[PDB]
Amino acid sequence: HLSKAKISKPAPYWEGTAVIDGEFKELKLTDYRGKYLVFFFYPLDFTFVCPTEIIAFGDRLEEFRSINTEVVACSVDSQFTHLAWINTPRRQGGLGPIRIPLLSDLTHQISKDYGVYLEDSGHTLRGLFIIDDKGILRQITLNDLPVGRSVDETLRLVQAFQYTDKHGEVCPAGWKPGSETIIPDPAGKLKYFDKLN
Amino acid sequence: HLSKAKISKPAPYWEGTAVIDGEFKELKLTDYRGKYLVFFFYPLDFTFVCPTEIIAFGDRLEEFRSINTEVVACSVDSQFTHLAWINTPRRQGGLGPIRIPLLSDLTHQISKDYGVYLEDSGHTLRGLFIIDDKGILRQITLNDLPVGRSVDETLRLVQAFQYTDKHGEVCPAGWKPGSETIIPDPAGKLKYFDKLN
Amino acid sequence: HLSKAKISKPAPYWEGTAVIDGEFKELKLTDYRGKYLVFFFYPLDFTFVCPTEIIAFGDRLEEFRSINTEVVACSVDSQFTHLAWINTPRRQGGLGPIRIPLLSDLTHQISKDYGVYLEDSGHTLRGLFIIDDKGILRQITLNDLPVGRSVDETLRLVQAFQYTDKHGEVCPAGWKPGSETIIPDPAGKLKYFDKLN
Amino acid sequence: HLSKAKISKPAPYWEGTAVIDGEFKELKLTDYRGKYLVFFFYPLDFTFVCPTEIIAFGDRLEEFRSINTEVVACSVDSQFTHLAWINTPRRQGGLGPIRIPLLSDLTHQISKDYGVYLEDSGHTLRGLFIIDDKGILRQITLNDLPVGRSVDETLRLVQAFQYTDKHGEVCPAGWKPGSETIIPDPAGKLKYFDKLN
Amino acid sequence: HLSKAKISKPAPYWEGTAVIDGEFKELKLTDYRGKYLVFFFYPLDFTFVCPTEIIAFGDRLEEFRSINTEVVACSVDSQFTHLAWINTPRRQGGLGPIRIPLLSDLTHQISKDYGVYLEDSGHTLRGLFIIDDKGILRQITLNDLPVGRSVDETLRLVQAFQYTDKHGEVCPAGWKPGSETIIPDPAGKLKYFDKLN
Amino acid sequence: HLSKAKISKPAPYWEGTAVIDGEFKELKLTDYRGKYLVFFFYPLDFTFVCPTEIIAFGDRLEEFRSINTEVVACSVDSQFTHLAWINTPRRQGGLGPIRIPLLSDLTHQISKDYGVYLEDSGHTLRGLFIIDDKGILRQITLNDLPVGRSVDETLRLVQAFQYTDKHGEVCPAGWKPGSETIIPDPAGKLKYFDKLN
Amino acid sequence: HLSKAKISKPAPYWEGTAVIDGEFKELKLTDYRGKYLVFFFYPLDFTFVCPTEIIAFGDRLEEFRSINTEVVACSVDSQFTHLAWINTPRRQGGLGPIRIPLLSDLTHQISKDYGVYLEDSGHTLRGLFIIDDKGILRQITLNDLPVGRSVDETLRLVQAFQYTDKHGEVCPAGWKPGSETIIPDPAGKLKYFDKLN
Amino acid sequence: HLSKAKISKPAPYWEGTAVIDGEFKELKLTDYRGKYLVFFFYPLDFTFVCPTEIIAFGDRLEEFRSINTEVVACSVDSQFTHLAWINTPRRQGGLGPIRIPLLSDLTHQISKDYGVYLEDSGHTLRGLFIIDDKGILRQITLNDLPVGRSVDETLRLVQAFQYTDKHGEVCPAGWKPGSETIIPDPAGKLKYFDKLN
Amino acid sequence: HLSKAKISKPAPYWEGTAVIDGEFKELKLTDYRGKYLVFFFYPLDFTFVCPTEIIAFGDRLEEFRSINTEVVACSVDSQFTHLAWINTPRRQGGLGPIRIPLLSDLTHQISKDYGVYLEDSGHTLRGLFIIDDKGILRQITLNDLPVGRSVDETLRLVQAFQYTDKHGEVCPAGWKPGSETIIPDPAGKLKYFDKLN
Amino acid sequence: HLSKAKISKPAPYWEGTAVIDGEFKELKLTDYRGKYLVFFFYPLDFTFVCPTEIIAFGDRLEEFRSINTEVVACSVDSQFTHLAWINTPRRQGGLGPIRIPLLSDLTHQISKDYGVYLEDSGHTLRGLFIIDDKGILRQITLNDLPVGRSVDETLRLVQAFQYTDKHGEVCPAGWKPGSETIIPDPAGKLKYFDKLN
Ligand SMILES: [O-][O-]
Ligand SMILES: [O-][O-]
Ligand SMILES: [O-][O-]
Ligand SMILES: [O-][O-]
Ligand SMILES: [O-][O-]
Ligand SMILES: [O-][O-]
Structure with a gap:
């Protein structure tokens, strides 16, 4: 089964x-x-x-x-x-x-x-x-x-999915509300990688 | 496959x-x-x-x-x-x-x-x-x-498994190191439930 | 299964x-x-x-x-x-x-x-x-x-099996301890059917 | 078969x-x-x-x-x-x-x-x-x-099924007609357990 | 089967x-x-x-x-x-x-x-x-x-098989003990057929 | 086949x-x-x-x-x-x-x-x-x-079947035309079995 | 089959x-x-x-x-x-x-x-x-x-097959004993096809 | 295949x-x-x-x-x-x-x-x-x-098969055109086998 | 696959x-x-x-x-x-x-x-x-x-297929544009072969 | 097959x-x-x-x-x-x-x-x-x-294989004997790619 x-x-x-x-x-x-x-x-x-x-x-x-x-x-x-x-x-x-x-x-x-x-x-x-x-x-x-399990982690994942559902930007490792996101494009991705480290 | x-x-x-x-x-x-x-x-x-x-x-x-x-x-x-x-x-x-x-x-x-x-x-x-x-x-x-994913969540999990390997106790929801643990049996378990209330 | x-x-x-x-x-x-x-x-x-x-x-x-x-x-x-x-x-x-x-x-x-x-x-x-x-x-x-379920009926069945296990005679409908039993043979069976009704 | x-x-x-x-x-x-x-x-x-x-x-x-x-x-x-x-x-x-x-x-x-x-x-x-x-x-x-088998047990059983068909209640161990019955739900059940003790 | x-x-x-x-x-x-x-x-x-x-x-x-x-x-x-x-x-x-x-x-x-x-x-x-x-x-x-079934017919068959078992001969239609038999080869068979007719 | x-x-x-x-x-x-x-x-x-x-x-x-x-x-x-x-x-x-x-x-x-x-x-x-x-x-x-095989036995068999087909009585062992037959039910079977043989 | x-x-x-x-x-x-x-x-x-x-x-x-x-x-x-x-x-x-x-x-x-x-x-x-x-x-x-079928054809074939068994040479269409045969190789085949035929 | x-x-x-x-x-x-x-x-x-x-x-x-x-x-x-x-x-x-x-x-x-x-x-x-x-x-x-193979045999066979197609009669062993044939029935077969042969 | x-x-x-x-x-x-x-x-x-x-x-x-x-x-x-x-x-x-x-x-x-x-x-x-x-x-x-791989060889092949696509001819070994072609039938093929040799 | x-x-x-x-x-x-x-x-x-x-x-x-x-x-x-x-x-x-x-x-x-x-x-x-x-x-x-097919292309291919077999360098597109080869690792590959072509 x-x-x-x-x-x-x-x-x-x-x-x-x-x-x-x-x-x-x-x-x-x-x-x-x-x-x-x-x-x-x-x-x-x-x-x-x-x-x-x-x-x-x-x-x-x-x-x-x-x-x-x-x-x-x-x-x-x-x-x-x-x-x-x-x-x-x-x-x-x-x-x-x-x-x-x-x-x-x-x-x-x-x-x-x-x-x-x-x-x-x-x-x-x-x-x-x-x-x-x-x-x-x-x-x-x-x-x-x-x-x-952890309620905080669960909270984080739900918020992350809801965010990414809304915006189409993606959620980096460790993402929480207010954190930087990434435009999932070979060029647009540089607004994130260039800006921070 | x-x-x-x-x-x-x-x-x-x-x-x-x-x-x-x-x-x-x-x-x-x-x-x-x-x-x-x-x-x-x-x-x-x-x-x-x-x-x-x-x-x-x-x-x-x-x-x-x-x-x-x-x-x-x-x-x-x-x-x-x-x-x-x-x-x-x-x-x-x-x-x-x-x-x-x-x-x-x-x-x-x-x-x-x-x-x-x-x-x-x-x-x-x-x-x-x-x-x-x-x-x-x-x-x-x-x-x-x-x-x-989250490095912090991964870390908490790894720590939890290492703890419960060592002490053969069990980790409640959200357990981070230093948190209360439970003794796995219907008798000894009550030293955590008469303690958290 | x-x-x-x-x-x-x-x-x-x-x-x-x-x-x-x-x-x-x-x-x-x-x-x-x-x-x-x-x-x-x-x-x-x-x-x-x-x-x-x-x-x-x-x-x-x-x-x-x-x-x-x-x-x-x-x-x-x-x-x-x-x-x-x-x-x-x-x-x-x-x-x-x-x-x-x-x-x-x-x-x-x-x-x-x-x-x-x-x-x-x-x-x-x-x-x-x-x-x-x-x-x-x-x-x-x-x-x-x-x-x-019924304890009495269960008691009766266990006693019946134990009896029949011991004697090889068989237990008629409604049998309880002290009741008449039957020799399971075409001739020996008549000690029971002849004796009572 | x-x-x-x-x-x-x-x-x-x-x-x-x-x-x-x-x-x-x-x-x-x-x-x-x-x-x-x-x-x-x-x-x-x-x-x-x-x-x-x-x-x-x-x-x-x-x-x-x-x-x-x-x-x-x-x-x-x-x-x-x-x-x-x-x-x-x-x-x-x-x-x-x-x-x-x-x-x-x-x-x-x-x-x-x-x-x-x-x-x-x-x-x-x-x-x-x-x-x-x-x-x-x-x-x-x-x-x-x-x-x-037992006619009496068979009779008790038949009576029990007829009762629980009629009243949609349930028959406890050994139930014979006139015995206490139970109401099948965690609430109403207690009118039998607070009564038999 | x-x-x-x-x-x-x-x-x-x-x-x-x-x-x-x-x-x-x-x-x-x-x-x-x-x-x-x-x-x-x-x-x-x-x-x-x-x-x-x-x-x-x-x-x-x-x-x-x-x-x-x-x-x-x-x-x-x-x-x-x-x-x-x-x-x-x-x-x-x-x-x-x-x-x-x-x-x-x-x-x-x-x-x-x-x-x-x-x-x-x-x-x-x-x-x-x-x-x-x-x-x-x-x-x-x-x-x-x-x-x-027929006891007579059954007997005739048993006798015939017993007969054909003991002798190198076969039993014609209707054979009973005493009756003409046939030698089962093309040459010997004629001692039966020329005689009969 | x-x-x-x-x-x-x-x-x-x-x-x-x-x-x-x-x-x-x-x-x-x-x-x-x-x-x-x-x-x-x-x-x-x-x-x-x-x-x-x-x-x-x-x-x-x-x-x-x-x-x-x-x-x-x-x-x-x-x-x-x-x-x-x-x-x-x-x-x-x-x-x-x-x-x-x-x-x-x-x-x-x-x-x-x-x-x-x-x-x-x-x-x-x-x-x-x-x-x-x-x-x-x-x-x-x-x-x-x-x-x-036997022509006489085959004739008996054919006559027996023709007869049970026609009369709905059954043919006892060795039945030849004119012999006693039996009525096929547990009561009318006594006509044949009592003093009749 | x-x-x-x-x-x-x-x-x-x-x-x-x-x-x-x-x-x-x-x-x-x-x-x-x-x-x-x-x-x-x-x-x-x-x-x-x-x-x-x-x-x-x-x-x-x-x-x-x-x-x-x-x-x-x-x-x-x-x-x-x-x-x-x-x-x-x-x-x-x-x-x-x-x-x-x-x-x-x-x-x-x-x-x-x-x-x-x-x-x-x-x-x-x-x-x-x-x-x-x-x-x-x-x-x-x-x-x-x-x-x-044909006795003569069957005889021609048996001979043809016997000849090729012995001499290891091959039999042309319509071969009866004494007829000209062919050597089974692209060199020794010219002896038959050329000048002779 | x-x-x-x-x-x-x-x-x-x-x-x-x-x-x-x-x-x-x-x-x-x-x-x-x-x-x-x-x-x-x-x-x-x-x-x-x-x-x-x-x-x-x-x-x-x-x-x-x-x-x-x-x-x-x-x-x-x-x-x-x-x-x-x-x-x-x-x-x-x-x-x-x-x-x-x-x-x-x-x-x-x-x-x-x-x-x-x-x-x-x-x-x-x-x-x-x-x-x-x-x-x-x-x-x-x-x-x-x-x-x-044989041109002559092949020719005999084609003719034999053509003859039997038309006349519906059968060709004995070694049949070449003009030869005596047989009528395919146990009565009309005596015309060939008897007196003639 | x-x-x-x-x-x-x-x-x-x-x-x-x-x-x-x-x-x-x-x-x-x-x-x-x-x-x-x-x-x-x-x-x-x-x-x-x-x-x-x-x-x-x-x-x-x-x-x-x-x-x-x-x-x-x-x-x-x-x-x-x-x-x-x-x-x-x-x-x-x-x-x-x-x-x-x-x-x-x-x-x-x-x-x-x-x-x-x-x-x-x-x-x-x-x-x-x-x-x-x-x-x-x-x-x-x-x-x-x-x-x-070779661009030159690749080009030659593309040209040859394009060629044989357009014309009722085939391209011999080594064919490049300009080269002799062959007419693919037993008669026409000889205009290529007699010429070449 | x-x-x-x-x-x-x-x-x-x-x-x-x-x-x-x-x-x-x-x-x-x-x-x-x-x-x-x-x-x-x-x-x-x-x-x-x-x-x-x-x-x-x-x-x-x-x-x-x-x-x-x-x-x-x-x-x-x-x-x-x-x-x-x-x-x-x-x-x-x-x-x-x-x-x-x-x-x-x-x-x-x-x-x-x-x-x-x-x-x-x-x-x-x-x-x-x-x-x-x-x-x-x-x-x-x-x-x-x-x-x-092409004898020239086949010759190139045979020479290419013989060469990589022998030298354990790899052959670039259109490689003919005497052309530049490449060392097959992410570092020694720069010998060929920098100013060399
Ligand atoms: O997700 O990249
Ligand atoms: O049991 O009879
Ligand atoms: O028996 O023929
Ligand atoms: O006789 O059935
Ligand atoms: O193409 O032959
Ligand atoms: O070149 O692998």
Whole structure:
């Protein structure tokens, strides 16, 4: 069963049950057309790096919505395990309330479509996908289990894609808002390389 | 032809001609055993984001070498084109001298083995790979063409993997050195969750 | 992927992580050679009929051990979800403590080997298997999700198999301990049919 | 040739000759639409557990008919052998007159469609199937040859499915009519768990 | 599954349980090596032409034994049905005691091997086979269901094959013991033909 | 090339050149619709058992024609050899003039169609087929080469079929015209079995 | 099944029963090693051109024996028909006695190996083969049915082939013994073409 | 690639360039419809037997035209070699002028269609075909290289085939015009065999 | 993937980005319809024989244009490398301004289509192709890496094909404009050959 | 049958009959090891461009032999046609006596091995191959039929290869003996490119 997630192609469609504001709702990738989506997998509810990452994105959710960007998290756990996790206090590795949908990939179909399913473990690694508003996949970040992801880096990449979507100039290594960009032409490129070093 | 690059498996072997310090030398993935390796692809010599990524890394090479980590870059261009690029002043979108190897992948074999090859274009996307001292692939970062990578994020990741190798603990979202870590078990985990609240 | 569970054949081998007396232990089907095992699947932790069944068997576990019979339960949930379920009080649909291993079938491999995996739902139906001490599968009970199983019936079947294992006489409809049995021979059968009605 | 019998799918269609009230009649699964059906296989006419199961059910037929439920039995024997069996006094391991149909499966087609056929023996094992009024298969009970089934368990099951059809609630372990039921959702479920404790 | 029965080839091997003198004995084709065997199939116990054929051969069995010839009958019925049939008085279409083995072919393998099986009915047609003391198949007689076979004709054939086995002669149309035979060569044949005419 | 001759299915169609009344005529199985047909193969013209069988049937043809039955013979010999044999005196092993058609099967298509062809010998064995007036195969008699068939047995068989065709009673072993028949149902079978025999 | 007759390749091996001076003898191709063999097929015994050819050859058999050549005729007809045809006076289209073996090919395998079999007719055409003392096929003459072959032409060819075997020189169009030959080289060819011709 | 030359079937179609009276003309098999055609292959231009045959035929071409027959020779040689061979004096192994078309088969397809191609030699053997006015193949003569063909035999055959076409009677062995023929039926065959012969 | 380049067949279609007069233009084979095209591959920008060949043709380009002939060069290098090569002074192995299109074949499709690709090296050998105004491929010249091509020879060939295109003549060895030509038929050819000698 | 001729791999092995010094000799590619070999195919003997190419090379053979080079010619014509052409005066389009071997490829195996065979015409096109002393193919020149090759260009090519073989410098476009060469590295390439040209 092959990974269908390819950069510059439509992100593999998905649909399933998620926990949104304490309730079970059906959620579809297509529900986010018009916005940038940060769609990310994490291994297991009731473990360790996993609460911290969901909390880090949830706590800073306004930074994303402020740039027309939603966030959705997902693991192979059921919607009932998600809801129990949410209902466990952060003190006991629970999540406590949260502002980001927790999608359920019980059948493992979505994980396989995104190429993050670990056949020997029965869950995903840490895979994060940045999908733009046309539904096109733009970025893929895959981390071995031990190492969590970074909201700042994710923020930077979304802003970079939105910028380059708007202007057609390109974003140099380390680019942040306000940084120099490059006209992607053999002559126009010299406005950047000549100006700075 | 399919990507052989899988997290927690040995990175796909490669060898080829690289420009090292103005000279052609035969470089092998295995020459880096014993050290961490940031192995990264970029589209085309004499383009745009491309020099700025190589420069960014090369110019900060010591922040990697000071943590037992090397950096190698790669494109489908020939070694002759790499050298001419290096021999082009930075002011014209050249690299000027550079301390990180430029590996050449004319046959596209390496790009295909790493699953970064773009069939419709004849070059790669922005693909970065973090390979540990034991040769195991730990992190995969893939960017669509317009958006460059970040030396700082790469550094944070390398540091995180080195930490969790050493202490067998796990790094939460956004972990930078000095940040709180977690002990991977339902019991001992609570010394972090009763501490962050 | 075909069901390997066939009556009068060795029960499909399994191994995985279970929660035994609050801890993660590796458990193997073979660990129960010498005893009758009641091995049963249930859909999801943090649901409804599922706690009641585990509780019904756990509370009456001594009735099984007293006849050389162990009980193991299993669902597609992780060992971390199991342990959280156990650590949720029975008042909130939790299990509270329990004396029966909760096996984890995260990869779905065991469920598929036993032919209880629901491809569209991502979990099992209510399947119960009675495996004797030689490791041979003797009985299969499969219930659609809404309807729970019965400890009394399970008790009856185990006793019936143990009896018939010992004596070679056969167990008539409705048989319980102390009931009439039948010599499985065209002549010897008449000691039963002649004697009663 | 594989079993077509799947829980929550329409029971595999069958038809054939049955002895009904001393006569040969053509019986179809579809003749039972509108009623629940206990459809059960047994090994061989003129054997042992076999008459006692048929008698047990037939003699208690009204406990099923009083709840809109029929009972049909089946073996690989011919209709001529079924009738001769019925025409054998119970005192000789016959059935004497019987009110439940004996379906004949000489071609083994039905036994194979239900996955109860024993290739090495040329007859079935003890297989029982509970099919609802809409024709959907709800319960599968398979016994190795020495051990008979239970009318009481069958009755409890039929009653349970009829209840959960009507009230869309779910039946806990051991549910007999009049027992507490559960409302299937993480909220309303607690009116049973805060009640049983 | 195709007929393995070929004239002048060794008769297809067979074995199974038979009722020999009211007892269940295991019977193999090879047990009859050294004697001629009349091996015949009939459709169903407790039917019509069927008892009369077994009886006809059973009553005249010494005529066969006195020429080193055995007789075995076979149907798809179980050995248990065979025995009940034997224990049924002839006046009710039973067989009463019988000296011919009744072989059971529940699995339908023997019938398929002898190409006498009816897929649409689930039992055999009227097939009879004459197998010599070397186990070579010599004669195949197949009748549609409603016409019974002939003991007289069967005897004549056995005698003729025994005859042509012992002598360098062939048996003309209608040959019975005592009749003119032919020497099978162009010269010797004329001692028969000139004489006859 | 496998045999198309199945009992109670239409007899494999055939056509070819037959010697009739000294002349070559085209002859077709369908020419015999409305009549019963005894169609039989024999090995080789100018052999031994062969002419006696053709003569036995020819000389007694009226016993067949007076019961709406024809007889046709066939071997792999050419029509010219057939004729040459017919023009050989009976005393030299010829047929002399003959009243039954001799069909020619040089290509072996017909023999192969009837499963009577010997691949190792290049001619048929002794195969006789009884085809009713509706063209349905009713009976197959196959003899190894050394033993001729019987006109008396063939007559009995033809009469038996004609009779069950007409009366829908069935024929017991050894049934000759005027013998007791049986009504084919489990109740009317007692007319024949009680005191009647 | 394809033809194996290839010029300058070994003639396809054959064996079978033949009529040699009124007797049935097994005959092998390898029996003629050392001698030249004219090997011809004819359509059918008891027909037309076919007798005249065999006689035409058989009468002049001496001219072949005085040049180390043997002859064998073959048809699809049985040995028994062959013998009958010989014992038929020439005046009635028979052969009368004959020195030329008549080989029998009932199975058709020999005709098929020699590419002379007529699938639609069931016998061969007029096919003649010239085989040298070392068993290599040297000549193939195939005639449509209506036209017979020539003893003289066959004699010319056998001689031509014998001459070129010895002298290693080549035979021009229309070569009969004593005629002028040609030396097979572009120098020694002028001896024939120039001054002489 | 297999031979398509089949007697009594249409001669395989052909076309190509030929040398007809010093000129290059496309030539088709269908060009000879209405006339008999002797069509022969020869190994090579500028060799040995090959010129004598073409001359042998070409000189006597009249005897073929006075019986409605044409002739065409063919080799694997190019038209340019054909023409050069014609413009080579007969005294130097040339043909000198010639009335017989020399067909060219450079591609070898025609030789392969006629089964005369020698795979190991790269040219044909001595193969001759007689084709009637309706384009049906009537005769195939194949010679090994060293032996040439006979104008007289070819003439006998063309006449024989023309006679049997008209009169519908058959030609005995060694038939030249005016000779006694045979009527193709077992009655009218006695006119030839009896009293006359 | 096999070479599609066949002489006298239409040249394999191609398109891609080329540097035409310092700009990136999209170029198709079909753009040259109506003119002759010299289409040539060279191994690598910034190498050795490579600049000299492009220069040689570039400098003498009017000699081609003045005969309705274009020239295009192609390597596996990117259009960006092409432009930098053009912008590199000839004194450092660059091309300086160039009037010949430089076509880019990054995907290797065009090179594979023209069978000039080296799988082991990742670039082409020295392949040159002459394509006429109808787009038919007329000439293929392939050189191993170390030997350069000849503008003079290339011109002679283009002129010769143009010549033989316009006139019913062929060009002998070494032909240049002005030289003797040959009339390609057996008669007319002699005006050339008798004259020359 | 695909072409085996690959540049810088060993030249497809070949062997056959060649006309040498008026006589037929067996000739093998390996006979030329140690020498460079110009091996070239031409369409057809007795055509037009063909003799001029053979004559041009033959008459200037010493220019090849004085540089350790041989020349061999080959077409699909037979060795007898080769000879006949050699014995044709140059004034009639013949070769007259000749000093280069004329190889014969009647079976086309050699032409096919070299990818020069025209399936539609049955002869080759104008294909020339330059094989070094180590038997490695160095150069392939293929011309459509109307244009002859050049002895001067072939000489240049042979000299170029001999020179790079010897000096390990590379040959620029139009290199003739005594012209400037280039050292094949990115630094020593400046010796040739600066002021040197
Ligand atoms: O350059 O992106
Ligand atoms: O009978 O079990
Ligand atoms: O008799 O069926
Ligand atoms: O003939 O038997
Ligand atoms: O020149 O490579
Ligand atoms: O011959 O061109």
